[PDB]
């Protein structure tokens, strides 16, 4: 009796939509604008099923039809991040914000990319901006913390403590922060995770997120065995489009 | 044509340059091998470097012109991040004006009488000189410069009437230059100031043969020489061909000549190495993020297995150095010549175009390119080739001296450093031989007249580098140096011809155009290779 | 918890470029009817292998609409009806497999499994005993037969499993799961032999898919639903989508979630 | 027409029948609710059942014809699995020949003088009779049958010349039947022998109304009656309509009449239950694999809440019984009448066609269907409705007798059994009232003349069921029984008319065709409902 979900499976809806999308794209029922939009949408779906190469294909095709979709560059940038090509990922996110400087999630994703790319101060610039846009979103404080931990461990912790104390404390993620701060134990975190999950999909999601941050915590302490297990347990949930799933995979790639 | 400052057009940033600046800054601050922070300390240095680009000789701008803009020197990072280039274009327009002032003053000084009897000197390196305080100080510096330019031409036999014709042409041309400068020239020089502060191989760019074999023979002994010009795609294949052919002859040893061999393909350094050693890693490549890739040759087949010398010089750069370092570290070949260039890094180009530029700003031109460092090379023993290059086992005389060229002299060259050694098996040792090879080498070159003359030229160059930048403005002192230079050369040539049974030259210009200098370093390396051949067959276990 | 765990398997680049290629070819009209039904079959097998069984069923149904006499297709539809708990219709599909081609062996396995989950233990044993005789050194054939016989007579199932092991060449890795079932080795030894035999993440994942399922079933039959539950989820975590053991770990969990 | 045995065509299996047999056997052995093994014991029983389909009366085949094929009776499972139908077609062709022998012998007998002055009897149930050993023995049995058929017609007033005209027509027609039998009739009967051995609702099939309300008024009190014919899709909606209407009329209590209400839609039993209670489960449905589904009405608006009686009889079957059992188990309504049918199972059809049949055998016809049991019903208290049905709280005199109808009498009906009770909250109790309801009921029906007559008919039917199957061949004995039957009926009717102030009938045939029997059970249920209303009010 640890805490495990049934790994998530494609829902019937996601699969009939894909089948429908294939027919529509084969048809001649779409404008160019409508087609680029649908290729985007099918990319988002394939990504959510964990088919990132099929996703990139639909995204590239979208940009070939219209090269000014910021929403598409954002995903290409994500993929370049998972592939370890940080350098090109920066280019993609710059493109997102050049098309639409209000596209906030580009700040998160460029920040993550800069984090994995060993540019911690620059990562902090992006992630602090992502924080200011929604400070009660705990995951924004968590990624900011990950970047600041590499600059100054003790000051990162202090800023994380402040971010928690100023927040409304509502969203579940603050519990991962509480763990990071030393306020609760790992068992209490897990206790609160089960209490907050209502069904298998929410359990899986919570475990994806939580095992990744637990994984990162242990890795930064040097415990590679525990980190390795935790990253795999995050991935086991099959929550394909969570950033935490994507970078659990990347973390495992780097431990190999 | 152009007679006043106010007819120099005032240069203005083009509509795309703000964007291009943001893009360049984005690449350099995020992806460069060197992890610099574009802070206030860095901004100041970009500023200083930009001034030296505008005025290399520190004789155009006033210290007051510089201090005006130096108050905001620490803001240049911000300017660059947000595409505000006011400081760069303001200084460039001020520099154009100040330049026209200097050239027009020079046109006036030219007609005044020339007197080269003074015992004054001219400094060729003013790069750390205080900025001149005023017009009088500028005017004295250009009196000096025009005198240097005049005397320079007098020493090539021209008359006073002809010196004034030439320098009129030259100074008027330098003024026509000013009027033909465009916005992109300014932008370009501003991005160069950013680039070259990071490292000397980084840049902004505005929008727009085979291996030869011979055989040398001393006594009845034979040495095969592979004259490799470059690490071109295909080299490793052409070298197999040549090694089979040398086998059909019976050579005691082989020389690979990588002198003046620069740049090249890294794959070719790896695969060429393969021909002389069994297996293993040749080089470790580190990216901008601490990640280390190890490159190996995985064919297994040694095609040579015999005594081998690698001949290298200060101009041996990049792929060349990898190959020589591998052969050294594996104990496979003796390295002979000079410490190499120390080009330990790799650069890559990136376009600044984006796929949506044409559509959203149709009236923009195409946008150009950046070049930046992304990788550093490390040897199998852990040390980088960056800076130190490869240190030969036998150093020719010109190698035991610090030279003007090489990565260690370039401006802001990244430092040498090291990582862990890779896993590998040495194929030989060769350390025993080193002290007998050196004793025999030193015996032979004490008696060779080319070497004797090289040591003489080195002693004389070394006692002269004190005042290397200080040139005399006395015509007689300078003619006398040119004449002792020509007389030494003539004697050198005639010493050679007497030894060879060739007729003496009467004067230096009677020498054929197509005259080939001898190659003492290659000749002496043949002797070194044969020495190696003996000590290697004389080894029992 | 220091379990043995693999990185859950991901679509390979090859599987995804082939799917992309398949979409284009089907969208062309360059294809005989035979060729098209064959390609739809192949794309279904690929989608099933990626865990997209509704997309698979769709390509399979489309294949039969073009040619209704592909036994290979009915076999998959029968499997899907098994995972859906519609055992009745699954039997129909397998009968159809064997009517088209009575030498299509895997229909005997799958109809066996279906009849097992459908509470027809004697009939299941008939199909699984026939599947056994067609390759007795394949340990998984002895394992599924044992699962069915366990419901008839626990003591005699075990004896027949012991005999099947003793007759065999003992070469294939799965005999180690049998050895566990027989009492000859401990759970820890099984896991030790699993890691020793695995060479890379894909082989580890596969071994864990298989092995966690049979461990799961062992504990379930002992009444330990917590351990069974964990083990089934751990099998599924490997994402070896086309293993029978993956499919029925899912089914077993569905029956624990209903109860 | 046709005069000799050898002009009856010899029937042969069609090319698809082997396959159809394999497909049928596959469905029945694998998917049926009942988990039987098609072994040797089962094969013999299929065999015995097949014989009874060929010769119900055990007067066509010889014991030696039967023993010929009975040697291999235990092999019929194999035959069915592998589509070998030689036994079924061989027996069927032999039976056709033997049948023609019987009919032609019967035609010859008709000419002989008829004498109905014996003390002989005829058995209507020969289904347990030894097979006749030879032609003499067959001939005695058909002497007896033809005498029954003759006397049967004599007792309806026909002349000897007219009896021989009719029976000539009948026996000649039965012979023309033999020649018009086809291969599919044989196959069909063979699959029926398999089917019906599993259970009586399983079959092989060859290829090709609203709610009424009234109000009864006894004394000053009013009772609403919902006459429900069937559990049709839409019923529950039409019943709301009618319940609001009775509310306007201010009724003391309501009767729901589910007599002769059979089959129907299970959803409607669930939703109808909803109108009278608010809880979860109404019924638990079990599949062929121990899996139990619980069906609930989840829109817990009660539209009635007043005293409620459910009136049921032996022909109340399936959906009906679920509704009545829910209302009983929840203590919501009093159930009155007879124990119901006990139809506790559900069947479904399945085509035998496969999508590749037309392509691979274009010459085949379409192939037809099976019907088999897939689900059994359980009540919320755990017990099935299968067999026992619903036992009323007050059983009308007709219910306190064993009947010849109902699932418990059908051949190989699945047994009653039980599962765990579901979670539920009883809405009332009503057991308090039971002993006073029964005392007042028993008082009223001792004095009612319809009930008094039913008691008499029951006593008389009980002393006669002893010999039910044994009919007399004495014309005088049989006329005298027909006349006491007509005279009893006439008196019954006349007793009624004298009480009602209506004219007496002189003879029974002067009775109007459209004459409606009274409904004593409904009348007495109105009284029961009002008793309930009193006792529920205080």
Numbering used by the authors:
A (entry chain A): 29 to 284
B (entry chain C): 25 to 232, 343 to 675
C (entry chain B): 28 to 286
D (entry chain D): 25 to 232, 343 to 672
Q: Anything the authors wrote about it?
A:
Prc (also named Tsp) is a member of the family of C-terminal processing proteases (CTPs) which features an embedded regulatory PDZ domain inserted into a serine protease domain. In Escherichia coli, Prc is involved in degrading abnormal proteins that are unfolded or partially folded and marked cotranslationally at the C terminus by an SsrA tag and that are exported to the periplasm through the Sec translocon. By associating with its adaptor protein, NlpI, Prc is also involved in the regulated proteolysis of MepS, a lipid-anchored hydrolase specific for PG cross-links. The activity of Prc strictly requires the PDZ domain, and the PDZ deletion completely abolishes the protease activity.
To assess the structural role of the PDZ domain and the hydrophobic sensor residues, which have been shown to be required for Prc activity, we also determined the crystal structures of Prc-ΔPDZ and Prc-L245A/L340G when both are in complex with NlpI. In both structures, helix h9 and the hinge region are disordered and invisible from the electron density map. Additionally, the entire PDZ domain in the structure of Prc-L245A/L340G is also missing in the electron density map. Nevertheless, the structures of the bowl-like body of Prc-ΔPDZ and Prc-L245A/L340G, including the protease platform, are superimposable with the structure of the resting Prc-S452I/L252Y. The proteolytic active-site residues in Prc-ΔPDZ and Prc-L245A/L340G are also in the misaligned resting-state conformation. Our crystallographic results also reveal that Prc-L245A/L340G, which does not contain the two ligand-sensing residues, has a flexible PDZ domain missing in the electron density map; importantly, the bowl adopts a resting-state structure showing a dislocalized protease platform and deformed active-site loops which are superimposable on the structure of unliganded Prc-S452I/L252Y. Since this mutant contains normal PDZ ligand-binding and catalytic residues but has lost completely the ability to degrade MepS or process FtsI, its structure demonstrates that the two hydrophobic residues are important substrate sensors essential for stabilizing the ligand-bound activated conformation of Prc. In contrast, Prc-ΔPDZ, Prc-L252Y, and Prc-L245A/L340G all failed to process sFtsI. Protein solutions with concentrations ranging from 10 to 20 mg/ml were mixed with equal volumes of reservoir solutions, and for most of the protein samples, crystallization experiments were performed at 22°C; the exception was for the sNlpI–Prc-ΔPDZ complex, which was performed at 16°C. For the sNlpI–Prc-L245A/L340G complex, crystals were grown with solutions containing 0.2 M sodium citrate tribasic dihydrate and 10 to 13% polyethylene glycol (PEG) 3350.
